Amino acid sequence: MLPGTFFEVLKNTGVVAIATQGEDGPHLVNTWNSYLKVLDGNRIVVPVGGMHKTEANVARDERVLMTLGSRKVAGRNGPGTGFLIRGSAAFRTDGPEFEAIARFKWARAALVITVVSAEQTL
Amino acid sequence: MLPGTFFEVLKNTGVVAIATQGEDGPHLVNTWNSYLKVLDGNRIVVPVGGMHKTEANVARDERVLMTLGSRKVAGRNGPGTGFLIRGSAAFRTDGPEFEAIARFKWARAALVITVVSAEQTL
Ligand SMILES: Cc1cc2nc3c(=O)[nH]c(=O)nc-3n(C[C@H](O)[C@H](O)[C@H](O)COP(=O)(O)O)c2cc1C
Ligand SMILES: Cc1cc2nc3c(=O)[nH]c(=O)nc-3n(C[C@H](O)[C@H](O)[C@H](O)COP(=O)(O)O)c2cc1C
Ligand SMILES: [Cl-]
Ligand SMILES: [Cl-]
Description:
- Chains A, B: It comes from Nitratidesulfovibrio vulgaris (strain DSM 19637 / Miyazaki F) (Desulfovibrio vulgaris).
- Chains A, B: One of its GO terms (cellular component) is cytoplasm.
- Two copies of one chain form a homodimer.
- By secondary structure, chain A is α+β, with helices and mostly antiparallel strands.
- Chain A has a single domain (1-122), classed as Electron Transport, Fmn-binding Protein, Chain A (Pnp Oxidase, Chain A, Roll), CATH 2.30.110.
- Chain A has three helices and seven strands, in the order H-E-E-E-E-H-E-E-H-E.
- Chain A has helices at 4-9, 52-60, 96-99; strands at 15-22, 25-32, 37-39, 43-48, 63-74, 79-92, 109-120.
- In chain A, strands 2-1-5-6-7-4-3 form a seven-stranded antiparallel beta sheet.
- In chain A, a hairpin with a 4-residue loop joins strand 5 and strand 6 (79-92).
- The interface between A and B is medium-sized, with 28 and 28 residues.
- Residues 13-14, 32-34 of chain B line the site of one chloride ion.
């Protein structure tokens, strides 16, 4: 599900954005490119310190969107690219998906996104 | 209302994320930090090439969220910061707000976000 160009983006620095659906509109939070941990089976794991509103949204609607990119990875028509990822999210406080990001001692949980599609948008 | 630290983030490269309310959940698109033009009266202007789905969403619900950041600008508790911006959006196709981004020869419109709040989230 995740292409090589996505893994090239993860070798570079940047701001990741994660959109969820809430009762009165979308919500949008961040992490860093370097914090994402990709697992077998199309999973992207994010260390969670805050994400309280995000977690409440995900408990009611698991579908999330994530974007990320880098000036330093070539896109289709010149330098710079990024991705729109769609997937289903879950929060974990134990098990191997939590252990994947437990090195971040500030992490109360892991946000685990099981990818359904990845689109290179540039 | 946009603070100095936000303009510091704009001196740096990065991926900007813009969330809108879609018919069946959020939508999320991107631009680059360096593409944003800030005008007086709390306005952030983005060059629009695609964004047809985003534009349809804004016509139904003008409220948008935007995030952006940089590893190179100090946050409250170490290196790296970013912002959550909430505002209302409109799409201009002539006049000073369009001229503000017309340097992008591929632009079909200017996305004008009038900022209601800016929160440094790191
Ligand atoms: C560049 C950047 C990176 C961030 N990294 C994280 C992160 O890895 N994990 C986290 O929980 N919050 C991180 N934050 C803060 C979140 O974006 C968010 O503001 C916070 O978790 C509160 O989430 P909520 O609004 O869903 O309650 C980061 C913020 C920025 C601007
Ligand atoms: C890093 C990055 C920068 C982008 N810059 C722009 C931009 O400045 N303007 C634009 O219209 N689309 C830009 N795109 C593409 C949009 O994110 C989006 O995929 C496209 O405009 C289609 O919008 P829509 O899904 O609302 O129809 C960029 C994509 C990436 C990954
Ligand atoms: Cl990073
Ligand atoms: Cl940039």
